């Protein structure tokens, strides 16, 4: 009773035509591709109501569309363009069942004129200020991941191998490095908030953890740096006297 | 199911006052309507859905909507927003009375919530870790949500807008932005500087 898409993210070169797969092991005969974009909420490109069965939605331009069997329901963009850039959700239902939609868990997909664009983030942390300490007891640790294109990643925060979110806040969205470049990179930050005395404790462990998705293995370069490809970039920092 | 909007892509309001996000329809069959809310990270989940079984539905989280057909309208309420509120939601309408048959979404509105904060220090702080190239972040926090960041003047000098952490053990929330840049002449102690309070401590 899940709706898998094939990839969380992906990347995309102008011109070039995508396929981004979903499967359902619900038996469910309807199954539904959505686009997802700022101020326009969701909007259904395609639908199916049966095994090859196919009808357009309100905004089919551009796309086409693939139910070979029950369980599968492949988007087909014909043309990667810019306005193709999107998170994709593809969802399933039951005519007969009463339980309505159940939701894959997005795939986003960012379309470039120009693969050799993509950077991982290099993933930098900052230890409290002396000052905020003693003027507060707590203890702010901030996250710097920078050096990233395209806006693909996924920041966490862990405290002795388990994973926090009490103390936590992210940029919901990056800053541009370079504002004036269209496709110029991207840095975001987060803070991490503890009580002076756990900073004050090298028994604790923290690590910054930045998931990058970039490129997938059958992707083809040769720049001398390494192939900047879906990956986990840490950085930590110990307890303190 | 023919069509839906949400008046309001953006909603800010207090944390513990009144949530309210629009929807409005309209069906030449008659309409079923659903509401979803979609948390920062995770994907979308149904709140609460209407079928003819009564007018005023009531929904995860603490939500509710009133069916008012006289309106053409689904609007969602919460009476006391909590932190945990915010997200984007959406309203969409079907034609099958479980939401089987294709469902037709509205544009959104996204939900922020507004801290209560109780006892505001506001101060600049510098930290580096010791590990030290390209490296110095400065960090203004504590202030109180009267208080906005503004972009950058210098393009070569980064400012990150306010971010709200909370450390939920000691019933204990906290604003914060930060600053940095590789510049050698670049002060924590005039880094940020509008819309900024006298009693900033250093």
């Known amino acids: 009773v899940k709706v898998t898409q094939s990839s969380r993210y992906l990347v995309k070169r102008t011109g070039e035509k995508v396929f981004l797969e979903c499967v359902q092991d619900m038996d469910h005969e309807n199954m539904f591709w959505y686009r997802q974009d700022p101020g326009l909420g969701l909007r259904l490109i395609y639908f199916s109501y049966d095994v090859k069965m196919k009808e357009k939605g309100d905004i089919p331009e551009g796309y086409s569309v693939s139910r070979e069997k029950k369980e599968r329901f492949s988007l087909i963009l014909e043309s990667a363009s810019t306005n193709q850039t999107s998170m994709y959700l593809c969802a399933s239902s039951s005519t007969g069942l009463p339980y309505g939609y159940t939701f894959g868990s997005g795939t986003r997909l960012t379309v470039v004129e120009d693969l050799n664009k993509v950077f991982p983030p290099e993933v930098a942390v900052f230890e409290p200020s002396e000052a905020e300490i003693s003027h507060t007891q707590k203890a702010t640790l901030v996250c710097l991941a920078t050096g990233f294109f395209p806006d693909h990643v996924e920041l966490s925060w862990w405290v002795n191998g388990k994973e926090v979110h009490s103390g936590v806040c992210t940029d919901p969205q990056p800053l541009k490095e370079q504002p004036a470049l269209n496709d110029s990179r991207y840095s975001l930050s987060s803070r991490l908030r503890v009580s002076a005395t756990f900073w004050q404790n090298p028994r604790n462990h923290f690590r910054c953890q930045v998931q990058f998705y970039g490129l997938s293995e059958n992707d083809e370069w040769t720049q001398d740096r390494a192939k900047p490809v879906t990956q986990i970039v840490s950085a930590e920092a110990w307890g303190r006297a | 199911m023919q069509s839906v909007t949400q008046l309001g892509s953006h909603v800010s309001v207090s944390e513990g006052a009144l949530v309210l996000l629009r929807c409005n329809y309209s069906?030449?069959?008659?309409?079923?309507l659903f509401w979803y809310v979609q948390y920062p990270n995770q994907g979308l989940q149904l709140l609460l859905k209407?079928?003819?079984?009564?007018?005023l539905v009531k929904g995860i989280n603490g939500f509710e909507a009133e069916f008012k057909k006289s309106e053409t309208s689904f609007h969602l309420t919460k009476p006391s927003a909590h932190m945990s509120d915010a997200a984007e939601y959406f309203c969409?309408?079907?034609?099958?009375?479980?939401?089987?048959?294709?469902?037709?979404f509205g544009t959104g509105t996204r939900l922020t919530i507004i801290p209560n904060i109780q006892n505001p220090d506001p101060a600049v702080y510098q930290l580096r870790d010791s590990k030290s190239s390209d490296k110095s972040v400065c960090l203004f926090t504590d202030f109180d949500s009267q208080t906005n960041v503004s972009q950058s003047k210098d393009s070569d000098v980064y400012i990150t807008d306010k971010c709200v952490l909370d450390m939920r053990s000691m019933d204990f929330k906290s604003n914060s932005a930060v600053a940095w840049s590789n510049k050698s002449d670049f002060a924590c102690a005039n880094a940020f500087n509008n819309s900024i309070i006298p009693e900033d401590t250093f």
């Open positions: 969409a309408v079907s034609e099958s009375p479980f939401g089987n048959e294709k469902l037709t």
């Open positions: 069906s030449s069959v008659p309409p079923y």
């Open positions: 209407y079928t003819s079984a009564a007018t």
